[PDB]
Write a protein that binds this DNA or RNA. Structure first.
Lengths: 321, 148, 437, 490
DNA sequence: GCATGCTCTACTGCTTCGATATCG
DNA sequence: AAGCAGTAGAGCA
DNA sequence: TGCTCTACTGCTTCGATATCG
DNA sequence: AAGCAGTAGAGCATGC
């Protein structure tokens, strides 16, 4: 997506600019049509919706007799649409204007709220605007000077404020964009303190045991005499397993149209599991901490599933006597 | 709170008086056997309180002398046999209005308590002096009419 | 005593300070409907029916002039929990007042939103339709619309919770039991709505089962199968499916509590066993094991609802082995050696072996088809077994009088079949049955 | 508890003087009190709309109460903020409202003392809910209401203690008679002025604290502890509509169904299949299979090793972070192990990595548990509570790839003037306050609809910048910053 | 030696609220 | 259920 | 035989709807 | 999820 706008500082600094989207939640674009049994056709059923009343029966109303209201205190206030269409906010087209700046990084990790990330790059077409903004990023990168943007999509959209932090990358340095919470979002309360705990104080034997466990269970190691860390088990390259499960199950019912559900393949669990050499390494300290810490503490298809003794010797029996 | 307070107060009276202004705060909230437990607390320290009547009539005593039980409606009359000889007849004549709906009651102990408060309200409201108002002469007119 | 406690109950409906009046309503109804139960005289009981069921005041205009509210809900629950008992202290002398009770229940169901005031207004209607039987009034309780309402409400209603989907599923079968003259066209479209749900609640591998819908669907199928039988003769697949679903509902299960799925599968078995008879054959081992297992479950209703299932099992396989006793010889020998192994034991309970004795007297019949002498080995073995247990040995120092019924029933069931009664044991047989007299 | 609502009795002094303008011409303290009470109801009708709010004037001529005391007159009763109750309330403004106060109840009497607190006590006793806080907010000026009798003073400080012990706490917004902090007198015993926090400051807020999930943390084999995943940034939105029958204004009890197999007749849900066509042919399933093809794991967090805090790049992002905490409700002895693992993770700068399944049937999802430590001083400032943080992590098809193929640089001279501009626009960021204009204008739209006052109170747009206070703030360097090297040059 | 009568405790379902996924 | 520019088929010349 | 309107149009973002803890 | 509120079931004490 190339989203176009004009980053204006003050009222005069015009920078023609485009922003592309980045890391976002992904789903699948084919929902389940509801057909009927024993004819197997889409159009064979149709739904209806009616609004009756609360009398002795269903003395109905119609579509031309319904207004929306809102809860307000201890009643519902009427006056549905032309009211709340006339008295609506107007966003005056798209807006990509700088609100302010900041230096002290009280903008941090845990306060982002925005379920995408907009990598705001540049523009094309004789890039005076892009050399201007690369001067802007080349002035923001060498300090802690973050930027704060006001961004909204269109006139129907909702207004947004967001962090703009420069980058760390060789081939480009294009500015990031996250949204930010509002004064009504950030609820926060009082979770208890753990340090001056007279009942839950850990013994330093348990401290060094857990330290031994952490040393036994690492996942990234510095090797190869470049003296940098290189990571085993990176959880940012694995494809998402639920659409592969859906893919092979639909393949299965498309091929063999009587068979039950196949259970999950084995290499999927191998891929979603770590290399168990760290399990073999941690076999000892996990048993250690399990000994040294004190005493901790149905599906439907699974719920409902003389001479008599003489002839006794002569025929066949056990041993004698 | 009220279960153990009732246990301690059934054997010891004067530990109520630290909490006597905090049983009445709870009393319009217990719609069960616990209300009988609060009234069992209340009866220990009635004979000696200052007023009691404003708080009792503010805490809706009328619609709780008229629920359905035998223990609740027995303690609800033992307190009223306690607080006769300190009230004024402007309010005893509104107390004698729902206590004479016990002519058509079962459970002979409850009727015995009723014909046990009326037996004093006749003998010590006979007006041994000359005349009084239209309340100290009307309570006798409604207690000479159930004792017949 | 009443009608003052009814005019004041109508006085606390229009007055201000509501929720100070709802508690007055609860206080009045609990004291009215308690006096109106402890009354043994048909004079005052002949009055109080017309006071309570009046049309000016009285307990049926309250729930139509206090229904579009929310504060009165304890009161509108208490009325419908009292009328289910005032239909029991009385009987069929509420014959005129009955279409009004039916209209009260149908409107209190369809206008309310709770689910603690839609349960007692479906206990009242079930007890009503089970007192006024196949009789005259069923052309006034209009079943041809009271079905279409409660059958539309399984499609045109989202998330009817649990214990309302119980009683809907049971009331959709009571209409096929009593008054089956109007349900010819719409009991064919009810077996599908009893089988689809009962499949979904027991074979779905995504969720956990809701047991108070299984109880309701089994108790509804167990009364639609009266008067609308589906034997294994004309189309024996639906009865196979009903046997498979009752058979998943009685597997030798895990340890449980809340016994209301086994105690409804067993009672669907113990009445309508005759419909499925071919399919009852090949599972004789496991069925016999589980019914003997459940026969002593230390729960004083699960025993009573397991014993009749065992009796109907034995009695309904006996008339199949005694029809073709050539290929069923291994079945006959297996049941015989099992009853022998029960009776040779030295155990505690008398209902442990009384079922064995009755099973032996049952299977005395099909031995005549294969030997015609073993019947004569019986009725001498039986009478010799039967006399000295209680006649002579400890005539008064025993506690053994509790299996003589199975003794005399077994003796009669073997005595019917043979010819040439051997003439010597009859003056002890006529000490026996006069001892049971 | 959880569902223990907040209570508030407003108690106003209408005895001798405040009804008069204190021989001034500016604003009577009576009108000050009525404006503050109306603003508190208007704030809590959408801020905390489940709480309890009563209002009681004392010292007036005629009287009404359940106790039948002289010269104590209650107005409303303990219930929610109701629009009809505030439209009753707003009639006591100005001289005409003062005379309406006169003809309705009349001011001026021999005002008594602690019996007004007794009426407040019986107003709190008769509630049929549970209440967390009990606050009496007294709106008055004077100092000696026991100026003659000393037994009245002793009885006042006895009844105030009888409210002190059973959990009723009062504060008095001391009305300044000349407008200053003057009366340093002797009601510091009864209490446990500024009224701007009662006047404007809470136009949009909501009160809630929920646990969101209560899961188990397992160390990949058998070692299990408890954890509960609270929430911090929930992205609030306006409440949704209600259908309504415009004749009598009643809701209409929507019911829907599916029907008509091209003949007539219902379909109970047992006879519908779930299908997906793919070009020519179909693929049919059952509802239980199309719900079963997403099942991977038991619900919880299985641990898969440890990584340092540095190599996870905290700009990879798709969902807001949640916040764990070690309960001792499922297992016992879990805060000990989590405190030990937290201090060792802190002193070794390492973070946990986990596989996460929230509910009883959800496909698995990789998360990173990054620690944090608290901070506390004498002022009790609270920006961090002592737990972890669940950074969600993308898998593979969240990241797109931009076309990237441009690279042209310039001269390193504009960085100094841009440093001057950003230092011109340098300030501390915030701690709050960038409120949502759409939700706030909708709030005031609904206020003016249910109260029919005048107009939409146009909300100020704090989200917008200050271009007047920015352009002349920076000054005449914008022309040189525009035209050093880059004018567009035509 | 079997049936019943009576209490208390733990299981279980409902109601309200808030968050999440889905379908236009 | 509503808008925003992108990409090939028509109208005057 | 040549450049602007125009039908579509893929997408994208709220807004209503349904599920689940 | 959170709170609560109502009923099923098991074990002691009694009776025929």
């Amino acid at each position: 997506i190339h989203w176009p706008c004009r980053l204006t500082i003050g009222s005069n600094l015009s920078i023609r600019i485009a922003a592309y989207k980045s890391i976002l939640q992904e789903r699948v674009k084919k929902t389940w049509t509801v057909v009927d049994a024993k004819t197997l056709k889409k159009e064979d059923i149709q739904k209806e919706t009616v609004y009756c009343l609360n009398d002795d029966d269903e003395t109905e109303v119609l579509k031309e007799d319904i207004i929306q209201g809102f809860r307000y205190g201890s009643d519902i206030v009427p006056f549905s649409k032309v009211d709340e269409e006339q008295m609506k906010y107007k966003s005056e087209g798209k807006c990509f204007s700088v609100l302010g700046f900041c230096k002290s990084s009280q903008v941090q990790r845990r306060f982002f709220m925005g379920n995408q990330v907009l990598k705001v790059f540049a523009a094309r077409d004789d890039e005076a605007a892009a050399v201007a903004l690369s001067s802007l990023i080349h002035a923001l990168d060498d300090l802690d000077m973050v930027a704060i943007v006001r961004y909204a999509y269109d006139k129907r959209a909702n207004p947004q404020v967001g962090v703009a932090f420069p980058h760390i990358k060789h081939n480009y340095e294009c500015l990031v964009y996250v949204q930010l919470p509002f004064m009504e979002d950030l609820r926060q309360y009082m979770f208890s303190s753990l340090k001056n705990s007279k009942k839950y104080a850990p013994t330093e034997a348990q401290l060094n045991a857990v330290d031994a466990l952490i040393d036994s269970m690492s996942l990234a190691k510095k090797d190869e005499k470049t003296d940098t860390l290189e990571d085993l088990f990176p959880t940012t390259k694995i494809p998402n397993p639920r659409f592969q499960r859906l893919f092979q199950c639909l393949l299965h019912r498309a091929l063999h149209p009587r068979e039950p559900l196949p259970p999950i393949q084995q290499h999927i669990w191998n891929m979603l599991n770590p290399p168990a050499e760290v399990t073999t390494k941690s076999q000892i300290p996990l048993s250690k901490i399990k000994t040294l810490f004190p005493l901790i503490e149905v599906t439907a298809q699974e719920i409902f599933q003389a001479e008599n003794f003489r002839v006794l010797v002569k025929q066949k029996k056990a041993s004698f006597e | 709170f009220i279960v153990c307070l009732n246990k301690v107060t059934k054997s010891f009276p004067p530990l109520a008086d630290r909490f006597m202004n905090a049983v009445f705060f709870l009393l319009p909230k217990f719609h069960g056997v616990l209300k009988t437990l609060c009234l069992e607390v209340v009866l220990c320290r009635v004979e000696g309180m200052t007023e009691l009547y404003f708080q009792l009539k503010s805490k809706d005593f009328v619609q709780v002398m008229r629920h359905r039980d035998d223990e609740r409606q027995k303690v609800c009359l033992d307190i009223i046999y306690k607080m006769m000889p300190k009230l004024k007849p402007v309010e005893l004549r509104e107390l004698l209005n729902p206590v004479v709906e016990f002519v058509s009651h079962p459970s002979t102990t409850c009727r015995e308590q009723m014909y046990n408060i009326l037996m004093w309200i006749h003998d010590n409201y006979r007006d041994p002096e000359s005349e009084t108002d239209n309340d100290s002469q009307e309570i006798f007119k409604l207690a000479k009419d159930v004792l017949i | 005593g009443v009608r003052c406690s009814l005019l004041r109950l109508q006085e606390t409906l229009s007055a201000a300070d509501r929720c100070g009046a709802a508690l007055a309503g609860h206080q009045l109804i609990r004291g009215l409907g308690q006096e109106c139960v402890l009354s043994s005289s048909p004079a005052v009981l002949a009055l109080q029916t017309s006071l309570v069921f009046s049309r000016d005041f009285g307990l049926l205009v309250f729930v139509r002039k206090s229904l579009n509210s929310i504060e009165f809900r304890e009161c509108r629950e208490e009325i419908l929990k009292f009328l289910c008992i005032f239909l029991e202290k009385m009987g069929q002398k509420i014959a005129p007042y009955s279409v009004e009770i039916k209209n009260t229940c149908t409107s209190v169901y369809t206008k309310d939103r709770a689910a603690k005031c839609k349960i007692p207004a479906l206990d009242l209607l079930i007890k009503l339709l089970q007192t006024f039987r196949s009789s005259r009034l069923m052309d006034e309780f209009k079943i041809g619309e009271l079905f279409s309402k409660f059958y539309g409400e399984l499609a045109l209603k989202k998330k009817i919770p649990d214990t309302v989907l119980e009683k809907v599923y049971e009331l959709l079968g009571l209409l096929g039991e009593v008054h089956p003259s109007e349900m010819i066209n719409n009991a064919e479209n009810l077996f599908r709505a009893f089988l689809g749900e009962l499949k979904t609640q027991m074979t779905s591998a995504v969720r956990e089962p809701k047991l108070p819908v299984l109880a309701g669907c089994l108790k509804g199928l167990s009364s639609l199968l009266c008067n609308f039988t589906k034997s294994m003769e004309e189309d024996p697949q639906t009865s196979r499916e009903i046997f498979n679903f009752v058979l998943k509902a009685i597997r030798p299960q895990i340890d449980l509590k809340r016994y209301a799925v086994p105690s409804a599968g067993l009672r669907l078995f113990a009445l309508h066993a005759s419909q499925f008879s071919t399919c009852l054959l090949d599972n004789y081992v496991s069925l016999f094991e589980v019914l003997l297992k459940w026969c002593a479950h230390t729960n004083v209703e699960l025993k009573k609802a397991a014993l009749s299932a065992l009796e109907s099992f034995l009695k309904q396989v006996s008339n199949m082995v005694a029809k073709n006793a050539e290929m069923h010889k291994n079945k006959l020998q297996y049941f015989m050696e099992q009853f022998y192994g029960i009776i040779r034991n030295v155990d505690s309970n008398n209902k442990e072996l009384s079922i064995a004795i009755r099973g032996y007297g049952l299977f005395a019949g099909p031995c005549k088809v294969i030997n015609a002498k073993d019947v004569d080995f019986m009725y001498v073995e039986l009478i010799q077994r039967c006399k000295q247990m209680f006649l002579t040995q400890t005539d008064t120092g025993d506690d053994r009088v509790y299996q003589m019924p199975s003794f005399l029933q077994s003796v009669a069931s073997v005595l019917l079949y043979l010819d040439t009664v051997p003439e010597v044991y009859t003056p002890v047989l006529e000490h026996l049955v006069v001892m049971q007299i | 508890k959880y569902s223990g609502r907040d209570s508030l009795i407003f108690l106003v002094d209408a005895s001798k003087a405040m009804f008069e303008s204190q021989s001034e011409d500016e604003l009577t303290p009576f009108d000050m009190s009525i404006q503050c009470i109306q603003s508190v109801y208007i704030s809590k009708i959408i801020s905390s709309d489940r709480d309890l709010l009563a209002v009681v004037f004392y010292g007036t001529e005629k009287d009404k109460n359940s106790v039948n005391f002289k010269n104590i007159y209650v107005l409303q009763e303990l219930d929610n903020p109701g629009a009809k109750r505030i439209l009753e309330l707003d009639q006591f403004k100005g001289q005409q409202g003062q005379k309406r106060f006169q003809d309705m109840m009349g001011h001026g009497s021999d005002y008594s003392l602690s019996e007004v607190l007794w009426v407040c006590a019986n107003l709190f006793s008769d509630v049929q809910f549970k209440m967390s806080h009990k606050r009496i907010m007294l709106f008055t000026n004077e100092d000696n209401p026991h100026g003659n009798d000393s037994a009245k003073a002793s009885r006042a400080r006895t009844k105030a203690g009888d409210l002190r012990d059973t959990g009723i706490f009062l504060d008095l917004m001391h009305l300044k008679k000349p407008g200053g902090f003057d009366i340093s007198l002797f009601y510091r015993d009864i209490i446990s002025s500024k009224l701007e926090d009662l006047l404007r400051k809470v136009r949009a807020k909501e009160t809630r604290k929920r646990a969101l999930s209560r899961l188990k943390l397992k160390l990949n084999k058998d070692i299990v502890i408890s954890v509960g995943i609270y929430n911090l940034v929930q992205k609030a939105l306006k409440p949704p509509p209600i259908k309504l029958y415009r004749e009598t204004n009643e809701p209409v009890k929507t019911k829907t169904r599916t029907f008509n197999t091209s003949t007539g007749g219902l379909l109970l849900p047992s006879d519908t299949k779930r299908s997906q066509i793919y070009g020519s042919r179909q693929i049919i399933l059952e509802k239980e299979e199309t719900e079963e093809l997403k099942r991977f794991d038991d619900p919880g967090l299985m641990l898969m090793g440890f990584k340092p805090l540095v190599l996870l790049k905290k700009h990879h992002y798709l969902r807001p972070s949640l916040f764990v905490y070690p309960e001792e409700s499922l297992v016992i002895g879990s805060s000990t192990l989590f405190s030990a693992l937290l201090i060792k993770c802190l002193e070794k700068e390492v973070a946990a990595l986990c596989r996460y399944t929230p509910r009883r049937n959800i496909p698995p999802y990789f998360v990173a548990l990054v620690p944090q430590e608290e901070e506390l001083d004498d002022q009790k400032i609270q920006v961090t509570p002592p737990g972890f943080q669940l950074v969600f992590l993308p898998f593979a098809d969240d990241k797109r790839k931009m076309p990237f193929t441009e690279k042209i640089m310039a001269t390193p001279e504009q960085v100094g003037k841009m440093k001057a501009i950003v230092e011109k626009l340098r300030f501390t960021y915030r701690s709050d306050s960038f409120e949502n204009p759409v939700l706030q204008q909708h709030f005031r739209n609904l206020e003016a609809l249910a109260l029919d006052l005048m107009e939409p109170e146009q909300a100020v747009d704090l989200t917008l910048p200050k271009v007047e206070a920015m352009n002349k703030r920076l000054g005449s360097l914008v022309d040189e910053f525009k035209e050093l090297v880059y004018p567009p040059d035509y």
